[PDB]
Amino acid sequence: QPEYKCIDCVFYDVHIDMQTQDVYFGFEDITLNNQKIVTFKNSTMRKLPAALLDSFRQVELLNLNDLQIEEIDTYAFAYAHTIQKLYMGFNAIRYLPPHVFQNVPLLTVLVLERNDLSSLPRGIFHNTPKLTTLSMSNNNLERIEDDTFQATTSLQNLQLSSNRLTHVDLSLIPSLFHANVSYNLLSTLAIPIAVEELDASHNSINVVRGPVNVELTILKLQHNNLTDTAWLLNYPGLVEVDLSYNELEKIMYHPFVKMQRLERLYISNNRLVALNLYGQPIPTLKVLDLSHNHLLHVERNQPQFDRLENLYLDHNSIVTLKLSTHHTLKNLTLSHNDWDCNSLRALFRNVARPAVDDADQHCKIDYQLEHGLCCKES
Ligand SMILES: *[C@@H]1O[C@H](CO)[C@@H](O[C@@H]2O[C@H](CO)[C@@H](O)[C@H](O)[C@H]2NC(C)=O)[C@H](O)[C@H]1NC(C)=O
Ligand SMILES: *[C@@H]1O[C@H](CO)[C@@H](O)[C@H](O)[C@H]1NC(C)=O
Numbered sequence: 001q002p003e004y005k006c007i008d009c010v011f012y013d014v015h016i017d018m019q020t021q022d023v024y025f026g027f028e029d030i031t032l033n034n035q036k037i038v039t040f041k042n043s044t045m046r047k048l049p050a051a052l053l054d055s056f057r058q059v060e061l062l063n064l065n066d067l068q069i070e071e072i073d074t075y076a077f078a079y080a081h082t083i084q085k086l087y088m089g090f091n092a093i094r095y096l097p098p099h100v101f102q103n104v105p106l107l108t109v110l111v112l113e114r115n116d117l118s119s120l121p122r123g124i125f126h127n128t129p130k131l132t133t134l135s136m137s138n139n140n141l142e143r144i145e146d147d148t149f150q151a152t153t154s155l156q157n158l159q160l161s162s163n164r165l166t167h168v169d170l171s172l173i174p175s176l177f178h179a180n181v182s183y184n185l186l187s188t189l190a191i192p193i194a195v196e197e198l199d200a201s202h203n204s205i206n207v208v209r210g211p212v213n214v215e216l217t218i219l220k221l222q223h224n225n226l227t228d229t230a231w232l233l234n235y236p237g238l239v240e241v242d243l244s245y246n247e248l249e250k251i252m253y254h255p256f257v258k259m260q261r262l263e264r265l266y267i268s269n270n271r272l273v274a275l276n277l278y279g280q281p282i283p284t285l286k287v288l289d290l291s292h293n294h295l296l297h298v299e300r301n302q303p304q305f306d307r308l309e310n311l312y313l314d315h316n317s318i319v320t321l322k323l324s325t326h327h328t329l330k331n332l333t334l335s336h337n338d339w340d341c342n343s344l345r346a347l348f349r350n351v352a353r354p355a356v357d358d359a360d361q362h363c364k365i366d367y368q369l370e371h372g373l374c375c376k377e378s
């Protein structure tokens with residue numbers, strides 16, 4: 001019958017396995033265990049016992065990170081009424097008892113990152129209306145049911161990256177400020193009204209929906225299945241959007257005409273054969289990544305290119321490129337294309353290395369190096 005004491009409370013060398021019977025925490029007199037901040041060092045609790053919070057009833061911040069927890073006793077959080085921040089990440093927890101969060105009304109932060117959760121009990125967060133930050137990344141979740149966040153009307157940060165999710169409707173959480181659903185199996189993305197940073201990279205998304213949102217500033221959608229970009233018109237505040245590794249076949253200026261401050265646009269590794277940002281260039285654009293596509297003719301985009309600081313054209317089939325004497329490029333990639341030699345000679349009157357970041361090493365029979373890049377004379 002071990003008795004673990006603090007030494008505002010750090011437990012040392014607590015070792016509870018599944019077999020272990022009841023153990024003791026703090027002083028027998030509950031009133032002496034008035035510590036508000038609880039953490040463990042060099043400890044393992046394969047099952048989280050009720051004895052901990054039965055004895056410490058004034059805990060506000062409970063850190064159970066990396067305690068090798070596999071199971072939570074059903075009534076572990078019976079006397080947890082004062083807890084505001086609960087950290088239970090980096091364990092091996094397989095399920096949450098249905099009413100585990102029934103008596104934590106003041107909960108604002110909950111971390112369950114890196115565990116073994118495969119589903120959420122109905123009503124798990126129905127009694128935690130103050131919840132503002134939640135992480136359940138690195139679990140095995142397949143579905144977030146639509147009633148999950150009905151009560152969490154102040155939820156601001158939601159991290160669900162690296163699960164197996166085929167459904168989670170973020171439109172049902174209008175309070176969202178930061179949301180991360182990267183590395184899942186989503187096919188549809190509804191973007192809530194006020195989210196400022198949203199990462200839905202590494203999914204299977206082919207449709208983007210939602211109301212005009214003037215707050216969205218960072219949108220990560222790389223590694224999905226997008227075939228259009230019209231929906232971009234709904235996000236006039238974007239500063240960065242990553243559309244790389246999708247199925248886009250053309251980029252036109254139309255979807256970007258409402259962009260007030262877009263600076264970084266990544267579109268590498270798509271299937272682009274057409275590019276028109278000259279009808280109406282994006283005035284604020286600084287970085288444009290068009291590498292690894294199937295572009296052939298892009299010279300008409302000069303007015304857009306002239307204003308950039310970084311332009312990546314490598315790995316296409318581009319034949320010509322024109323820049324004004326006063327262009328602002330600081331980083332340019334050009335290798336692995338299909339250059340006309342005359343175009344390269346003209347180009348290098350206004351730009352050179354190391355601004356030009358790359359080069360071709362060898363050329364095919366009909367080609368030769370012109371300023372370090374393969375080209376054919378015509
Ligand atoms: C969404 O969550 C993922 C995973 O937590 C974040 O991935 C990190 O991204 C940075 C670069 O921005 C990498 O250097 C880190 O290694 C990544 N962390 C991990 C654990 O993989 C990602 O940043 C999040 N998205 C946003 C926009 O915040
Ligand atoms: C989406 O893209 C991935 C990777 O290219 C591909 O394997 C998958 O077939 C695509 N998904 C659908 C449903 O088109």
Ligand SMILES: *[C@@H]1O[C@H](CO)[C@@H](O)[C@H](O)[C@H]1NC(C)=O
Nearest residue numbers: 310312330331332333354357
């Ligand atoms: C230029 O951009 C490329 C992106 O392909 C990057 O790898 C490189 O570090 C940049 N070079 C400089 C000098 O910043």
